[PDB]
Amino acid sequence: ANIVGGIEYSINNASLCSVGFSVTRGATKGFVTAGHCGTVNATARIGGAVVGTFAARVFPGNDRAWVSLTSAQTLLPRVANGSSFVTVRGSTEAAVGAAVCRSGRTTGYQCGTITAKNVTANYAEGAVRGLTQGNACMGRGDSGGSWITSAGQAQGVMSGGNVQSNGNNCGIPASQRSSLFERLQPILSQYGLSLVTG
């Protein structure tokens, strides 16, 4: 498969999440995603084919993971945007107030602005701390997906936020949306991963 931020993958043939970013570690191919998407050794599929397995994860407290891939996977420095993409250029963190977009298999590519940092999400499974908030909407299935500026600076991976009874927060105003991401650089640093850039 072509490994692109925002695309669907399944976990154990049972749940769906979204790719965060293509990464490497030496000769091992991988992608980063959210920790609640899977436990270690769970099987990831794209297009119905096994692509790899979860290598490591932290959830709750943090909400991060990476999936180690078979060598046949094709890593791209890209985040899906409808029928095109944004190229991943780097990982410079954006400030509160700055425009940011996110990508995922339920809501597709959504844009808004960064509205807080250091937010705790009190999920039923446990608190997740240190999250950055934006007002782009999102919904269930989007988790793990890329957050990235239009200039290609990768920000983090979708964690969650104030999903409504319909499974998303697209049906409320942007001023009420809490769409939370796990910052990327601490994920790359804990796991010793290099972000694939173009």
Partner: peptide, 4 residues
């Protein structure tokens, strides 16, 4: 809040 809930995970997505």
């Amino acid at each position: 809040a809930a995970p997505x």
